[PDB]
Design a protein around this ligand. Sequence first.
Ligand SMILES: COC(=O)Nc1ccc2c(c1)N[C@@H](C(F)(F)F)CCCC[C@H](NC(=O)/C=C/c1cc(Cl)ccc1-n1cnnn1)c1ncc-2[nH]1
Length: 238
Amino acid sequence: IVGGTASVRGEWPWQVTLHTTSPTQRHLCGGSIIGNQWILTAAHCFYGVESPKILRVYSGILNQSEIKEDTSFFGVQEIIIHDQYKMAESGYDIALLKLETTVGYGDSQRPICLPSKGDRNVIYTDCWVTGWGYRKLRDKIQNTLQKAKIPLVTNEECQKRYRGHKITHKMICAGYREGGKDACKGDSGGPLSCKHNEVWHLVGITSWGEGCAQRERPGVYTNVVEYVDWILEKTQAV
Ligand SMILES: COC(=O)Nc1ccc2c(c1)N[C@@H](C(F)(F)F)CCCC[C@H](NC(=O)/C=C/c1cc(Cl)ccc1-n1cnnn1)c1ncc-2[nH]1
């Protein structure tokens, strides 16, 4: 996160850190708890990932230093990638992780609500991007979960900012015209959380941008409201 500040413990209880175990253990991507055995994240996180066996999901983490060999985690039973996904810049950048065990909900780990189909017509004015990613292009993963408040940008304005790309309504953009606040390397897969009528909604999944926090380069997120039926198809399968 560029231009953010330290989160407080329990502030983003749906935020997870997804770690890879091969060749050595390290943070891979962010993610969001959406159900007691479900993590919603970005499809591009699994590039080269040949098996769910190398994945570890940690919930209830403020600091990456809380993670050692004796720290409990959730194993991943299955990686579900949207089957229209090709690359982050073309959209469909969404994936689900089916956990091997159930998350016990508490004040440290709980799910974020998905947006409603009717809420597609609502204007969100209180949106935050969170993660352990870089503070600038050449940096390192941060120990403490960071947060940054960012305004949503219309599809028309985002398309103006990305000449040469096709910004679809399945993407949602966020950033200041002058830049300064954004997601950066290591934040992808994490949430873009918006508070509406005292309820937090998972509005976006951190996907891509041209550089980090640059002037007139909004962050591009998977527009979660456009995938509610796809998520329900995969998580509510009979
Ligand atoms: C010690 O642990 C470690 O250093 N972990 C570590 C470190 C860095 C990484 C990473 C793991 N993840 C990638 C990989 F390949 F390293 F595993 C996979 C994932 C590959 C893509 C990922 N993209 C983002 O996270 C966000 C991009 C992004 C999103 C928005 Cl909304 C705006 C601007 C953006 N940026 C433009 N340029 N940079 N950001 C990333 N790139 C490097 C990493 N992640």
